């Protein structure tokens, strides 16, 4: 109870600068007091034990940091070094272990009817991420596994291993949805919760490898996780086709889009620059090469969204299907599109499907361009940027070209 109380207590440029100072003040008071040592000790005691109390401690720890603050980080590092440990990493590892992942059997039982827990895993991964930031070549190095402790741990390696499992569950769930009309609901919500947790984990992972620390990055790259993100990238594309494919509609689409952007950011971050021809670059190129079809599908989808919008904007298109109050009529929109003469036929049918009929092949359309153009504009940019940077860095290889 006391720990919870402490966390609660911790809780426009000028305002921003200030607010920060005030936060720094409360956190500072707690820090002066030695709270960090307490949190570390509590974490160590868990000894891999799983309990809310452990959860409460984690929450308190997150509260202590937040927005960094060096005295605290320094103190924690110093304490760990002084204690020479300990197997605190061991407990942390056990927890990095045992995090819930979406399970199809459980979901089915629920549907037949809590479960798919828990958000707290998200909170722990978040603490691990809060640890990164600020940027410690020394800290990142310790995170790698440290030197003094007899063991070491592959920490980042462990987080990477965990992410892979989370992607597998998401993929299994998509496979199960199959595409039976949807959205079913209830489940969609559970899925969203899952997607959200994964996003935080992904962001934390990126931050950990985010610092341009040669050792951490090199290590992750050699490690094993890819792969992994390669598979996640593939699933993401199918989910993306599905929404949009029906008026699930917008919230789910937005959530799906955000996660993809985060993944792209992490990928861009990994290279962190390099030789014109570089091992990391070669590996990235290789992953891209391995996936031509999935990538192609994503690119095609983006072009279609943009191309369609452009067409709509066009006067000739407006002219082909005059209406008293909008719509290109089912026929009617199809014919105009045919007229501009630039589309996949299956793609054209798909576009027609994406468009929502309203009692007689009538489409407001402008609404169509707006959604999904705003979200696309936000994500699309990140993708383009990454692609461009990659192209600039290593030509050849041509396949990439």
């Amino acid at each position: 109870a006391y720990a919870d109380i402490m966390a609660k207590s911790c809780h426009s440029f000028e305002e921003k600068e200030m607010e920060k100072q005030r936060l720094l003040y409360q956190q500072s008071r707690l820090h002066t007091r030695g709270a960090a040592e307490m949190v570390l000790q509590m974490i160590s005691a868990c000894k891999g034990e799983t309990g809310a109390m452990v959860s409460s401690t984690l929450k308190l720890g997150i509260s202590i940091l937040n927005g960094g603050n060096a005295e605290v980080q320094q103190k924690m590092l110093d304490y760990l070094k002084d204690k020479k440990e300990v197997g605190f990493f061991q407990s942390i590892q056990a927890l990095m272990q045992t995090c819930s992942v979406l399970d199809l059997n459980a979901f089915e039982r629920q549907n037949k009817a809590v479960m798919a827990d828990d958000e707290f895993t998200q909170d722990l991964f978040r603490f691990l991420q809060l640890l990164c930031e600020g940027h410690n070549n020394d800290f990142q190095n310790y995170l790698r596994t440290q030197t003094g402790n007899t063991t070491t741990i592959n920490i980042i390696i462990c987080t990477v291993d965990y992410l892979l499992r989370l992607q597998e569950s998401i993929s299994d769930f998509y496979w199960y949805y199959s595409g039976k009309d949807v959205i079913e609901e209830q489940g969609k919500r559970n899925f969203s919760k899952a997607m959200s947790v994964a996003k935080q984990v992904f962001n934390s992972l990126t931050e950990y490898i985010q610092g341009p620390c040669t050792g951490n990055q090199q290590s992750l790259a050699h490690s094993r996780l890819w792969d992994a993100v390669v598979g996640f990238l593939h699933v993401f594309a199918h989910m993306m086709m599905k929404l949009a494919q029906d008026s699930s509609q917008i919230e789910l689409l937005k959530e799906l889009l955000d996660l993809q952007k985060d993944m792209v950011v992490m990928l861009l971050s990994l290279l962190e620059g390099n030789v014109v021809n570089g091992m990391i670059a070669r590996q990235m190129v290789d992953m891209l090469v391995e996936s031509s079809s999935n990538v192609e599908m994503i690119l095609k989808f983006f072009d279609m969204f943009l191309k369609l919008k452009d067409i709509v904007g066009s006067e000739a298109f407006q002219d082909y299907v005059t209406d008293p109050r909008g719509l290109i009529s089912k026929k009617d929109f199809q014919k105009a599109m045919d007229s501009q003469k630039q589309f996949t036929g299956p793609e054209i049918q798909f576009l027609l499907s994406c468009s929502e009929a309203d009692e007689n092949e009538m489409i407001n359309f402008e609404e169509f361009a707006n959604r999904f153009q705003e979200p696309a504009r936000d994500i699309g940019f990140n993708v383009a940027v990454l692609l461009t940077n990659l192209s600039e860095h290593v030509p050849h290889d041509p396949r990439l070209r």
């Binding site: 059997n105 089915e108 039982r109 037949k112 009817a113």
Partner: protein, 317 residues
């Protein structure tokens, strides 16, 4: 402690809810298992299901775990019968078979998971029939009730029916009078109740089969256990009559006429009246002298008598 195991019987939500790890642990204990082990297995089966029908998810998990570890008395039924003769373990094996049967999928395909259904089917041998044969040999009695249940769950019937009928007809002779007083039959009577539901489900064989129906009516009346169950058996007989067949209609008809004469107890008379109504329904289009004699009995029956009287009157009408 099971008992503690029982803690969960009637509830559907709780059953759907139980985690697979616990089931796995129970399965492991069963595998390690041994009469006590068999009892544990039976408790586990009850827990696994409960009806009406069985949970698809729970059933699936149980079947898969069982298929994965085999326990499993080496392999058969004949061996068990031999062991019984030497003498239980047979009871435990029967319980396991019963659990598998309860585990059976329904209502019907498709689909699917009838794979699955097929794995289970392979699991039985030759099969429900072998079990029926074993039951006939046995003709302990309470035991193998599941096998009868399993065959229905598990799945030309008349040929199969012939073997079953012989075992039955007997019980009736033993049951009535002193024997009726004897309680071994009562255990048998309960099985009879289960069989009738199964009962509820060339021509010469059918006619012989017709004799069995008369025997069943005789058992029904009477002596003397409830009753409500008796009524169920009776409805089944009535249902069988409805499904039915002139010769069967005949000899049974004469016995029935004699019974009617005796009546002219009350419940038996009502059943007879229902049967008569059924015969009439079957008789728009429809020996004859015997029927006329029976009718004269009705006129006589009306005379003998001279609400419940009202129902009797409807029957007379």
């Amino acid at each position: 402690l099971d008992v503690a195991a029982a803690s969960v019987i009637d509830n559907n939500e709780l059953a759907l809810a139980l985690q697979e790890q616990d089931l796995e642990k129970v399965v492991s204990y069963l595998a390690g298992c041994p009469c006590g082990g068999e009892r544990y297995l039976d408790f586990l089966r009850f827990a696994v299901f409960v009806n009406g029908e069985s949970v698809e998810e729970n059933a699936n998990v149980v079947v898969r775990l069982l298929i994965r570890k085999p326990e499993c008395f080496g392999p058969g039924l004949l061996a068990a019968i031999e062991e019984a003769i030497r003498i239980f373990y047979a009871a435990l094996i029967d319980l396991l078979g019963r659990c598998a049967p309860e585990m059976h999928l329904i209502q019907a395909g498709k689909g699917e998971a009838l794979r699955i259904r097929a794995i289970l089917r392979s699991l039985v041998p030759l099969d429900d029939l072998v079990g029926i044969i074993s039951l006939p040999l046995q003709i302990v009695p309470d035991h193998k009730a599941s096998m009868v249940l399993f065959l229905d769950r598990v799945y030309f019937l008349l040929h199969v029916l012939d073997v079953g009928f012989l075992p039955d007809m007997r019980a009736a002779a033993s049951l009535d009078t002193a024997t009726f007083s004897t309680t071994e039959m009562a255990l048998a009577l309960n099985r009879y109740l289960c069989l009738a539901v199964l009962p509820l489900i060339p021509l010469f064989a059918g006619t012989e089969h017709r004799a069995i129906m008369v025997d069943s009516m005789l058992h029904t009346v009477y002596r003397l256990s409830r009753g409500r169950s008796l009524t169920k058996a009776q409805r089944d007989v009535i249902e069988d009559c409805l499904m039915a067949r002139p010769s069967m209609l005949q000899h049974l008809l004469r016995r029935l006429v004699f019974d009617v004469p005796i009546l002219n107890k009350m419940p038996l008379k009502l059943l007879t009246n229902h049967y008569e109504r059924c015969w009439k329904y079957y008789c728009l289009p429809t020996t004859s002298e015997e029927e006329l004699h029976l009718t004269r009995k009705l006129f006589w029956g009306i005379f003998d008598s001279l609400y419940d009287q009202e129902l009797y009157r409807m029957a007379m009408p």
